[PDB]
Amino acid sequence: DKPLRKISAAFKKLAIIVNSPNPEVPVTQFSHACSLVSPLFGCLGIAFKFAEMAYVAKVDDLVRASSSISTLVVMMDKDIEADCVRKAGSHTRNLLRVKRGLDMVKVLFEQIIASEGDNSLKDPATKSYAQVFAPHHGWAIRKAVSLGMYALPTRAHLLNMLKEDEAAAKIHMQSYVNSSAPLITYLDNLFLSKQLGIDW
Ligand SMILES: CCCCCCCCCCCCC/C=C/[C@@H](O)[C@H](COP(=O)(O)O)NC(C)=O
């Protein structure tokens, strides 16, 4: 089906889990949902090429992890026990970056919705990247991203690539925004509650 619909369906499900008492988020289900977001970065063009190493490789690792590890909590606790939380390539470091990817797409969608009537994606792309990723990327990446903003598809072109009209895309984006918000909060709080921080 259409990429935004796959996304909204999968995250609705995740929202139910996190909004319930004693949530257990399976690594399989979380990593599959996160993989549905990947095609979005590609639709945005060269500006978001960083997403392959920054997001896709990370989801790939969680996909791998999911065969032997039950939940995100158990996954994090294993890395804590092994004292390898901030190590390059740890599941937990990867989870934190995946969280940022989910957040950037959330903010992007919010801004696209807020700017209905402007056929340019420049502000929404620039704003969300600035809010979510800019504080963690080095100079060269930030400069490259900014330059790549001239290569964004128009708003109408993007809708066409995602195979939706304005009304339908609005609903599915809003749905992801509503679903992903408590998930992102859930994830932040796992890090915060285990005294790991979220700014590294
Ligand atoms: C012919 C020219 C082709 C143009 C180049 C295409 C875009 C290149 C953008 C590459 C972005 C690389 C980002 C690297 C990802 C991670 O390995 C690295 C470290 O991963 P980490 O955040 O520590 O887990 N992340 C950062 C932002 O330093």
Pocket of ligand 1 contains residue 99 by CB under 6 Å: no
Pocket of ligand 1 contains residue 137 by CB under 6 Å: yes
Structural domain boundaries of the chain? Answer: 1-200
- The Cα–Cα gap between 7 and 69 comes to 23
Q: What is the DSSP string of the chain?
A: --HHHHHHHHHHHHHHHHTSSS---BHHHHHHHHHHHHHHHHHT-GGGTTHIIIIIHHHHHHHHHTTT--BHHHHHHHHHHTT-SSSTT-HHHHHHHHHHHHHHHHHHHHHHHHTTT----HHHHHHHHHHHTGGGS-HHHHHHHHHHGGGPPPHHHHHHHTT--HHHHHHHHHHHHHHHHHHHHHHHHHHHHTT--S--
**Experimental technique used to determine this entry:** X-ray
Q: In degrees to the nearest 10, what's the CA dihedral of 62, 63, 65, 68?
A: 150
The amino acid at residue 88 is: A
Report the Cα 180 to chain-centroid distance in Å: 9
Distance 15 CA to ligand 1 centre (A): 30
Pocket of ligand 1 contains residue 97 by CB under 6 Å: yes
Pocket of ligand 1 contains residue 141 by CB under 6 Å: yes
Report resolution (Å) to 1 decimal: 2.2
Name the residue of 141, 198, 199, 200 to mutate for ligand 1: max ligand atoms within 8 A of Cβ. 141
Class of domain 1-200: mainly alpha
